[PDB]
Design a protein around this ligand. Sequence first.
Ligand SMILES: CC(C)[C@H](NC(=O)[C@H](C)NC(=O)OCc1ccccc1)C(=O)N[C@@H](Cc1ccccc1)[C@@H](O)[C@H](O)[C@H](Cc1ccccc1)NC(=O)[C@@H](NC(=O)[C@H](C)NC(=O)OCc1ccccc1)C(C)C
Ligand SMILES: Cc1ccc(S(=O)(=O)NC(=O)NC2CCN(c3nccc(C(F)(F)F)n3)CC2)cc1
Lengths: 99, 99
Amino acid sequence: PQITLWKRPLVTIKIGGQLKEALLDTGADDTVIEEMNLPGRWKPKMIGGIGGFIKVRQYDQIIIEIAGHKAIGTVLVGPTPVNIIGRNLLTQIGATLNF
Amino acid sequence: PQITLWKRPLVTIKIGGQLKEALLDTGADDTVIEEMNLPGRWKPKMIGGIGGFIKVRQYDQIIIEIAGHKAIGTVLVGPTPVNIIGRNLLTQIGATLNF
Ligand SMILES: CC(C)[C@H](NC(=O)[C@H](C)NC(=O)OCc1ccccc1)C(=O)N[C@@H](Cc1ccccc1)[C@@H](O)[C@H](O)[C@H](Cc1ccccc1)NC(=O)[C@@H](NC(=O)[C@H](C)NC(=O)OCc1ccccc1)C(C)C
Ligand SMILES: Cc1ccc(S(=O)(=O)NC(=O)NC2CCN(c3nccc(C(F)(F)F)n3)CC2)cc1
């Protein structure tokens, strides 16, 4: 695809039989989601935001379809105001910024 | 150019006749920049993201060069831990997410 940026880059993501939407986010080191019935336990983490720092729940080896493409990685769950797909998962599906 | 994303996409910018580096941020609705005086009048605004909210001086019709591409737009001035060229100005230089 070749997505223009006049609106938010929200794409259909799927994860362990859960259809959702998410934000392709070139300024996000990590992928961060609001909830999902993920692999039980989670090693805790801290992530950096514009308005301070938040505590999240890290889950690894996570299979996720993004916009068609398959991806494997580290989905954090945290108090995010929108499902964010960061560079860790954007790399694998070949996603690049262009101008 | 075509920017892969294994690292942060920081680029050279020129703003207020001052050279900076700044992160190309497709999740950001607005453009946010660290302290500096710009010309013209500002008006208060709060923006929010991860961690919570910050306060900003919003400036308008602010001429800005980005990886050597000219652009007029709204630019927010406030204490971000990083300069962010969000979607408002990305649409001007013709930026797209390609995969
Ligand atoms: C996703 C995170 C991992 C990411 N943070 C990082 O990658 C940081 C630097 N690194 C990191 O987490 O590494 C691990 C760690 C941290 C420190 C040391 C060791 C361990 C991040 O906060 N990403 C943001 C940029 C950033 C990075 C460096 C430091 C400061 C800010 C935007 O790209 C990202 O797009 C966010 C997510 C998002 C998108 C849209 C909606 C709300 C939040 N947007 C924003 O912060 C922007 N806000 C918006 O687009 C609009 C204007 N506001 C909004 O819709 O907010 C309403 C909202 C606020 C409050 C609660 C409910 C709703 C923007 C203006 C800066
Ligand atoms: C391989 C390939 C090359 C070129 C193209 S394109 O057709 O010249 N450009 C384009 O289509 N832009 C927009 C429309 C489709 N869209 C999108 N693309 C993928 C996945 C999702 C979804 F649903 F999950 F959200 N949405 C937004 C961008 C296509 C394919």
